[PDB]
Amino acid sequence: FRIAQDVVARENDRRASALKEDYEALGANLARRGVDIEAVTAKVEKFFVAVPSWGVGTGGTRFARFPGTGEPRGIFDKLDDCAVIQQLTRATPNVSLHIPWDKADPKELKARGDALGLGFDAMNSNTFSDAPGQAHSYKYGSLSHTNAATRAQAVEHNLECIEIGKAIGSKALTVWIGDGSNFPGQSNFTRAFERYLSAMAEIYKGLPDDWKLFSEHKMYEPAFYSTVVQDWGTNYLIAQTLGPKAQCLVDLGHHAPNTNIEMIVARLIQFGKLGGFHFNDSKYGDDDLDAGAIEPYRLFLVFNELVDAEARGVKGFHPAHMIDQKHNVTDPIESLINSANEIRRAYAQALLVDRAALSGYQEDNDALMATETLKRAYRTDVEPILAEARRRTGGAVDPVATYRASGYRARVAAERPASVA
Amino acid sequence: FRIAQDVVARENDRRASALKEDYEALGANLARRGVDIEAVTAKVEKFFVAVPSWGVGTGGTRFARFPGTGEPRGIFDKLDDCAVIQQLTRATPNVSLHIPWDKADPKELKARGDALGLGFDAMNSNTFSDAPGQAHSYKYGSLSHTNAATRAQAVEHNLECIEIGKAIGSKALTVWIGDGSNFPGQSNFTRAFERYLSAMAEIYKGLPDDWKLFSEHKMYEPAFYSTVVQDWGTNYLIAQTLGPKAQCLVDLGHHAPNTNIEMIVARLIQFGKLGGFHFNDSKYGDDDLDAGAIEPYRLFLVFNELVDAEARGVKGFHPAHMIDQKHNVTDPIESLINSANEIRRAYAQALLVDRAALSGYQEDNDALMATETLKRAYRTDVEPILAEARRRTGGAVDPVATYRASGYRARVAAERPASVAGGGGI
Amino acid sequence: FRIAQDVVARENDRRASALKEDYEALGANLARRGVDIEAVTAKVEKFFVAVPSWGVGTGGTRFARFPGTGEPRGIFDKLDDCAVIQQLTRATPNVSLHIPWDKADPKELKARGDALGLGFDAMNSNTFSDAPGQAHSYKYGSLSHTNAATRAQAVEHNLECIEIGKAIGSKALTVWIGDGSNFPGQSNFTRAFERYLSAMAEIYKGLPDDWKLFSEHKMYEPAFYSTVVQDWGTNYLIAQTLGPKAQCLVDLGHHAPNTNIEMIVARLIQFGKLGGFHFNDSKYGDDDLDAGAIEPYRLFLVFNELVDAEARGVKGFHPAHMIDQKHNVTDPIESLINSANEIRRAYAQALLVDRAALSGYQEDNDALMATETLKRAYRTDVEPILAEARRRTGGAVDPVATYRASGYRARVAAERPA
Amino acid sequence: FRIAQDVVARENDRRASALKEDYEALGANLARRGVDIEAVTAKVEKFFVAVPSWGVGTGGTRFARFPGTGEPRGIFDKLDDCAVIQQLTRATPNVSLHIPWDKADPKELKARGDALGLGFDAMNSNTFSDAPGQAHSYKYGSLSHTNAATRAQAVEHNLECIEIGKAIGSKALTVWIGDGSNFPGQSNFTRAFERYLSAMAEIYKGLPDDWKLFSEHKMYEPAFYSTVVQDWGTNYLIAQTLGPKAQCLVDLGHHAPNTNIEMIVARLIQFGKLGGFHFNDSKYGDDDLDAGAIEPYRLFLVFNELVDAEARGVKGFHPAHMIDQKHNVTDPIESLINSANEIRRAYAQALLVDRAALSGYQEDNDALMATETLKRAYRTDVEPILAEARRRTGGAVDPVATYRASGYRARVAAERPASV
Numbered sequence A: 001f002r003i004a005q006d007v008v009a010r011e012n013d014r015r016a017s018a019l020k021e022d023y024e025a026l027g028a029n030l031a032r033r034g035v036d037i038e039a040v041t042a043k044v045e046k047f048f049v050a051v052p053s054w055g056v057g058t059g060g061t062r063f064a065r066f067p068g069t070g071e072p073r074g075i076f077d078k079l080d081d082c083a084v085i086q087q088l089t090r091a092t093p094n095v096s097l098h099i100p101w102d103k104a105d106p107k108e109l110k111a112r113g114d115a116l117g118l119g120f121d122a123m124n125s126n127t128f129s130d131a132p133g134q135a136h137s138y139k140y141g142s143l144s145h146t147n148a149a150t151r152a153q154a155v156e157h158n159l160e161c162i163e164i165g166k167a168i169g170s171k172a173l174t175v176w177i178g179d180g181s182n183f184p185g186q187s188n189f190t191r192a193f194e195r196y197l198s199a200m201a202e203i204y205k206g207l208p209d210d211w212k213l214f215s216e217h218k219m220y221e222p223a224f225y226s227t228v229v230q231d232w233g234t235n236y237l238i239a240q241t242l243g244p245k246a247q248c249l250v251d252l253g254h255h256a257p258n259t260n261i262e263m264i265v266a267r268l269i270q271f272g273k274l275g276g277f278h279f280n281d282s283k284y285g286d287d288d289l290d291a292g293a294i295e296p297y298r299l300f301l302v303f304n305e306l307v308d309a310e311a312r313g314v315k316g317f318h319p320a321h322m323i324d325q326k327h328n329v330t331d332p333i334e335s336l337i338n339s340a341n342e343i344r345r346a347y348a349q350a351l352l353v354d355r356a357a358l359s360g361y362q363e364d365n366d367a368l369m370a371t372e373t374l375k376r377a378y379r380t381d382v383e384p385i386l387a388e389a390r391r392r393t394g395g396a397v398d399p400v401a402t403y404r405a406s407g408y409r410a411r412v413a414a415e416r417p418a419s420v421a
Numbered sequence B: 001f002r003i004a005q006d007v008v009a010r011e012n013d014r015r016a017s018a019l020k021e022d023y024e025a026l027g028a029n030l031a032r033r034g035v036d037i038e039a040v041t042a043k044v045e046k047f048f049v050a051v052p053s054w055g056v057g058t059g060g061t062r063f064a065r066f067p068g069t070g071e072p073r074g075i076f077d078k079l080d081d082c083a084v085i086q087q088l089t090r091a092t093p094n095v096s097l098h099i100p101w102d103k104a105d106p107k108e109l110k111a112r113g114d115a116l117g118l119g120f121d122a123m124n125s126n127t128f129s130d131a132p133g134q135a136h137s138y139k140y141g142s143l144s145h146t147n148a149a150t151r152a153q154a155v156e157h158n159l160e161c162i163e164i165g166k167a168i169g170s171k172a173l174t175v176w177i178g179d180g181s182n183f184p185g186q187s188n189f190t191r192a193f194e195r196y197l198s199a200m201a202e203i204y205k206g207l208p209d210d211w212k213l214f215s216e217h218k219m220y221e222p223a224f225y226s227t228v229v230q231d232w233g234t235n236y237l238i239a240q241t242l243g244p245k246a247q248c249l250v251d252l253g254h255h256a257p258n259t260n261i262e263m264i265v266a267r268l269i270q271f272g273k274l275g276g277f278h279f280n281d282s283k284y285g286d287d288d289l290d291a292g293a294i295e296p297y298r299l300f301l302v303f304n305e306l307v308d309a310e311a312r313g314v315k316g317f318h319p320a321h322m323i324d325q326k327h328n329v330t331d332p333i334e335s336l337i338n339s340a341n342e343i344r345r346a347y348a349q350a351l352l353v354d355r356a357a358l359s360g361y362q363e364d365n366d367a368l369m370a371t372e373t374l375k376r377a378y379r380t381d382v383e384p385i386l387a388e389a390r391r392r393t394g395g396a397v398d399p400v401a402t403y404r405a406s407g408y409r410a411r412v413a414a415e416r417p418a419s420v421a422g423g424g425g426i
Numbered sequence C: 001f002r003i004a005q006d007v008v009a010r011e012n013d014r015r016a017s018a019l020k021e022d023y024e025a026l027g028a029n030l031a032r033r034g035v036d037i038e039a040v041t042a043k044v045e046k047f048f049v050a051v052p053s054w055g056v057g058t059g060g061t062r063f064a065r066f067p068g069t070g071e072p073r074g075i076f077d078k079l080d081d082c083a084v085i086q087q088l089t090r091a092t093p094n095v096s097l098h099i100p101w102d103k104a105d106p107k108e109l110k111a112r113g114d115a116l117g118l119g120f121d122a123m124n125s126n127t128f129s130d131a132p133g134q135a136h137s138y139k140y141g142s143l144s145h146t147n148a149a150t151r152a153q154a155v156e157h158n159l160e161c162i163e164i165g166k167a168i169g170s171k172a173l174t175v176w177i178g179d180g181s182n183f184p185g186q187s188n189f190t191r192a193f194e195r196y197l198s199a200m201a202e203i204y205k206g207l208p209d210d211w212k213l214f215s216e217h218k219m220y221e222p223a224f225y226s227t228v229v230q231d232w233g234t235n236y237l238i239a240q241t242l243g244p245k246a247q248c249l250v251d252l253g254h255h256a257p258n259t260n261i262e263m264i265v266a267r268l269i270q271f272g273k274l275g276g277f278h279f280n281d282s283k284y285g286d287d288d289l290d291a292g293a294i295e296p297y298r299l300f301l302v303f304n305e306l307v308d309a310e311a312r313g314v315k316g317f318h319p320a321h322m323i324d325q326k327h328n329v330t331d332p333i334e335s336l337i338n339s340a341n342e343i344r345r346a347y348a349q350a351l352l353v354d355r356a357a358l359s360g361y362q363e364d365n366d367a368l369m370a371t372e373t374l375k376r377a378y379r380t381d382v383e384p385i386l387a388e389a390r391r392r393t394g395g396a397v398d399p400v401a402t403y404r405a406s407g408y409r410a411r412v413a414a415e416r417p418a
Numbered sequence D: 001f002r003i004a005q006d007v008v009a010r011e012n013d014r015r016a017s018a019l020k021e022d023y024e025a026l027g028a029n030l031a032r033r034g035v036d037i038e039a040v041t042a043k044v045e046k047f048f049v050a051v052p053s054w055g056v057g058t059g060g061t062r063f064a065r066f067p068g069t070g071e072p073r074g075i076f077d078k079l080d081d082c083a084v085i086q087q088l089t090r091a092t093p094n095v096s097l098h099i100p101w102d103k104a105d106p107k108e109l110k111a112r113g114d115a116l117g118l119g120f121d122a123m124n125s126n127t128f129s130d131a132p133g134q135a136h137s138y139k140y141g142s143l144s145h146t147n148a149a150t151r152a153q154a155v156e157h158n159l160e161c162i163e164i165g166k167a168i169g170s171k172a173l174t175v176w177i178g179d180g181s182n183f184p185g186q187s188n189f190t191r192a193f194e195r196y197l198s199a200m201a202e203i204y205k206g207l208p209d210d211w212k213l214f215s216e217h218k219m220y221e222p223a224f225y226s227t228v229v230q231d232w233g234t235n236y237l238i239a240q241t242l243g244p245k246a247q248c249l250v251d252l253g254h255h256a257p258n259t260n261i262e263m264i265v266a267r268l269i270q271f272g273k274l275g276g277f278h279f280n281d282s283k284y285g286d287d288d289l290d291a292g293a294i295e296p297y298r299l300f301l302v303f304n305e306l307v308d309a310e311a312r313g314v315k316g317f318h319p320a321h322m323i324d325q326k327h328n329v330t331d332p333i334e335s336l337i338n339s340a341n342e343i344r345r346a347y348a349q350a351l352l353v354d355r356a357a358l359s360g361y362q363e364d365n366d367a368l369m370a371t372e373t374l375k376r377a378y379r380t381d382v383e384p385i386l387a388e389a390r391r392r393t394g395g396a397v398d399p400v401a402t403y404r405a406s407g408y409r410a411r412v413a414a415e416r417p418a419s420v
């Protein structure tokens, strides 16, 4: 136990009275609305979202990085920190690894994971930066590079990621690359995309029978004029071209200003290509902020589409849920804790939507009552449900408060050497 | 001839000397660059783009409409005005009709067109507004409306557009609808799209063997929260689902801020679904401004993708080019003239790109020289080519100047009723 | 009483038990948080926002207008419909008039208002469209038009709006114009702005000393290349140049994509030029949608700045609140009702913010707890407070439910055949 | 000379015949339009834009940095490379320094600049990153940080930048900070701005009589929710509050999507607060791409406002021009060369605008001819003018071509060891 059980117990007991009052009051309100609070809590306690290993350490911008104390030394330290998030929120049992950042003996990774009660989600390849000893640089691209030898090198890297994933329990590979151009004319749009498709076809051939291959689109950054996998349209073309094992991953902050993201989610689901999500929030670009910290309603609307899929009886729909955030001005552990909480919050609210009533309002084109039906769910403070879900599963009623009371950050700050070069 | 031939001749002779000097200088410059100016002019002379019948009348916004003098009374006046654009620019031989706005006897329409030297491009259906005597309102949608009878009415309307088109020589139907929602929850995104696909399938069944069905995406307006055919991704799904006769139409001002539109064009070409274009310019939303008046380089970049495809000869590839603009503060005829000119300008510059050099710089990842290779073409003032193309094909060296010298606007102002200012409405 | 009192009473009694349960539950929760629910309800009951006369009728786009049944046929019908919004929500006692759309005998307008329990907020001038008999067209502008006679005509129109307002109790003039250009070069940015400033100075000269002059910025539409009063920066320059009675009006949907609007609010307050607001919501452009229907948190953050101004001790700050929306696919009355409700919702939530705790986290740079402090207020379902506030002041526990139960729309549909 | 004169001469001679033909042809075309090409060349040769010391090295993103060969390490190597840009384009005689990146003995810096034929433009302070041994971190801000000692440290740093500038010939200090918040509530907008204004007032007090203080606004990045100096509105409030020595700096890529930037320029000019520019191009955010590589017309429209201000003799008009770009996938020197070229290109085209005709069309509300009047100027290929201006003043007819023929990159690659 990364966090002493007596601390979790003490903090839960300190807040037990208030939780009881709030949960029971909410339960009565929901009952009057025809909703069984117990049914909602039972589903919420089962909702999981993968934590990014790269989000456990402090992030930075192209301008600067301002590390905090106790920054993780490597993947093992990162797993230890992820274990804290899982213990307290009980919503993050799986971790997303990024290669080569987290490269290590697969057996050892698996051993540490099992010891901490953690599993592993989709693997993430990295051909948007150069590792030492590469025969070819990814400066001008990777899977879509004009040089065949460079593309082959990128393909082999992705295959290595699959090998590592197979050994640790992963069942998918997420491919996000920076491939694109910064100047008009620099790249032939079609040829670059064709090169990418050929390279991905090779990676696809290396997928086990029960694995999925996720391609992640992004409008811009690092490329500032054009990006090969720039949007969901191109992403759909990728998934459809590659095969049934290939699907699309939607990262919330990767869309053009004002884009209706929840519709994109609906479209991909309709055509069976919604592989998963990379949750985060943003206001300007790919800000990678704590989920729901900027636009909580949008997060709810995305989950409204996810829950509607279940309501429409979509078969074989098991999208992967993952947090993809960077924490530049907060304790990464605290931000991941509250972000996972916010994701469960939006999910819980989506479960509250009276879809029988909503369907009627949609049929009759009663736009006002239709939107009010979504709002009645969204306006509901489901914090008591999230807190109770944590209580019953060994978590903390107030995760961040318990984390702070444990003195964990100071502890690891004394065990981990800060970077000096 | 809408414009007296002696006026066209007089205004051309007045500018012939300067044109000769500019054309010969550009010719020498292009020769030093290994380019034969005659080959470029020959292609420019053959580049055509359709003009919208609804574009020759003054447009407006939801706040007001400020009509000018000599506004067209109906489709016959509109065709007469479009004839001026074609006579002077020689780049707009075909007109795009919108139903029911341009409803009229098909035989009479065909007759006026043939007499004016105009043909007809894609028909445009209208299920984004209610017409008098209409049984079902399109307030909450049309092809994707929840009410079966309303969807059926919309389908029948589109089939009627096909029938009118068949009678006048049209070979395509462009479908743009406002269908969408203004509030979260109002529409079920998936069910609405399913209804749309089913309705379009019925329209597709009524398409002649040599016809095309174009669906046009738009991010927003009139719907302000969600739109059924919101972007090119959804548009691709539509075209792929319907069949080989269904393709996507790209309207420049219908994309999210900062979208790389030229890439969308390339992607659609790659997958054989680029049906055509709706040219215009914009800075904020679907502004429908004169093509190239705001971002001329973007227009060139779009044409760079078109010419690349036209270069490696993607056989059969014949996208339907059309101007889709609204003119709220200028003489519509003058704006359409200069807009058509700007479209030919971008095309001409794209033709100047050294494709071999560009390919070399792309393969070598010489980003700077690759971009400079495009700029060397774009920086070239091709006006002499555009002017000479017009001069030798019956047009005017300086179209707007000749239009003004003819006094055409004052002429039609005296032949048509005066207009009154009003509220919103296109 | 547009809505029968027995209907209001009936529908309130039907929901009285549930409200009592929810209100008491919330009261207990707030007490544990050191907040007295009664103090919040008292303030919510006094928060008012003006309703736009041009918003009670169905709106439309440049593509089409789809009227519903019982459409108001003029300003008098519009006042009758506005009376319904006020009676049920008790949050919209004042109506904003637009001239010449609402031209009618000022004396009669006032008489109708008094009879309906409605007052009048800021007057709105219209030099973005042409009226019959107008000597000069506003096609190429109004207050900033290159033609002196056209500018003078626009100034005179604004002065006429002031005279109408003085007769009905209005104390402010809001000026929003479409002036701008659709093409580079069409206008000389500086000269057009100089003309605008000179014309506005003439309006200011004729502004009563008990009135305020509000200028409203807008990034684009109807002008699609440049707009004279395009943003808050230009707006500030205008207000500062004209004088102390001139201030800036912030319409939520009039900003560039991703703009931090709440910061603009804070800036104008700091420099004493925040005249008021035009509430609405949007996702793409100036969509004019129901307030809070798209981005409810943003609305809360705007109110967080308004409440902080009070907490900071800002003096002489009494911004004019107005709803500026168009309703194209809903019953205008229902939309205005729920929009007024949403505005009070955001206000109530802003009042729940623990200012002392927030200040502490801000000074200590505890970003996570600072943001969580705002969320603790925002996540609170204040509907019971809004409902009780309405019940206590003569309104309805569930406004739209009561509205539908009354059959008012069907009633006016029958009274206003089309 | 960084580039051998015989190479410059040789590469000019091999392109002289074509230039002669193009310049004479453009001269005739302009003559038919009532314009004296020599008059345009005279103005173009006097247009200068400062090159950023931090621009000659290869840039990167938060994801990675892919250095090229012969990367300049330190201000001395950087000045050597900036010297090449000036020698070949003759449009960048001054360099913008950034402290502490370019820290070096002032006397030595000035001596090096003088020897290379380079001057120094506005100094740039850096309180958006932490330097080793720093007592207080700028993680949560600098000039507007909540902690007094931190603000004091930031103020002192800026005063140090002024001292360095005074020693080398600079006459201005540009202040761009990342100060802001990533979460609603994290900062109190007003209090943060008050702190910023008070701190800047202290910096203002340290300005020599003939110095200017430039504040640079930016919508976002590094702050992703709010930024203290977020737009030109706040920037204007800053300048007006601080005093006559304080003006606003407009960086093209620092505005919200679809913003009409040229109007912002016009507004600042009208109120005498246009301190200067940071030229670059962009398509999505603050991309820092080569000027004019994405939207050349927008660049021309900005220059149209600059030339109009001059035409009407606007009082107090004298903006400082600077390039602020990052080069991630090109040779930095080549990009700066062509960027400086694009800036002079837009300027030259703006000079071609028939101001009398334009004024007439504006007064008569002839929108179509007004816009065509701008287009007639913009459509003109002024490359011959730019090239001839360079040829007559010691520069290269085709700068990048001469640069590549010189083998300069390979030369410094041999003199400067790469990481690998």
Ligand SMILES: O=C(CO)[C@H](O)[C@H](O)[C@H](O)CO
Pocket: A054, A124, A176, A216, A218, A251, A278, A286, A324
């Ligand atoms: O979102 C992404 C890049 O912006 C990808 O998912 C990356 O792999 C991830 O963020 C780590 O950099």
Ligand SMILES: O=C(CO)[C@H](O)[C@H](O)[C@H](O)CO
Pocket: B054, B124, B176, B216, B218, B251, B278, B286, B324, B426
């Ligand atoms: O672009 C469109 C609507 O914005 C469609 O093409 C219309 O049919 C056309 O613009 C006429 O309104």
Ligand SMILES: O=C(CO)[C@H](O)[C@H](O)[C@H](O)CO
Pocket: C054, C124, C176, C216, C218, C251, C278, C286, C324
């Ligand atoms: O917002 C506005 C125009 O976009 C102004 O407030 C108008 O006067 C109002 O909306 C009525 O059109």
Ligand SMILES: O=C(CO)[C@H](O)[C@H](O)[C@H](O)CO
Pocket: D054, D124, D176, D216, D218, D251, D278, D286, D324
């Ligand atoms: O533009 C800026 C930051 O985005 C400032 O001018 C910086 O000081 C400059 O770019 C160096 O990073």
Ligand SMILES: [Mn+2]
Pocket: A176, A216, A251, A278, A324
């Ligand atoms: Mn991601």
Ligand SMILES: [Mn+2]
Pocket: A218, A251, A253, A254, A286
């Ligand atoms: Mn990302």
Ligand SMILES: [Mn+2]
Pocket: B176, B216, B251, B278, B324
């Ligand atoms: Mn169109």
Ligand SMILES: [Mn+2]
Pocket: B218, B251, B254, B286
């Ligand atoms: Mn359109």
Ligand SMILES: [Mn+2]
Pocket: C176, C216, C251, C278, C324
């Ligand atoms: Mn408004």
Ligand SMILES: [Mn+2]
Pocket: C218, C251, C253, C254, C286
């Ligand atoms: Mn508005």
Ligand SMILES: [Mn+2]
Pocket: D176, D216, D251, D278, D324
């Ligand atoms: Mn800058």
Ligand SMILES: [Mn+2]
Pocket: D218, D251, D254, D286
């Ligand atoms: Mn910058």
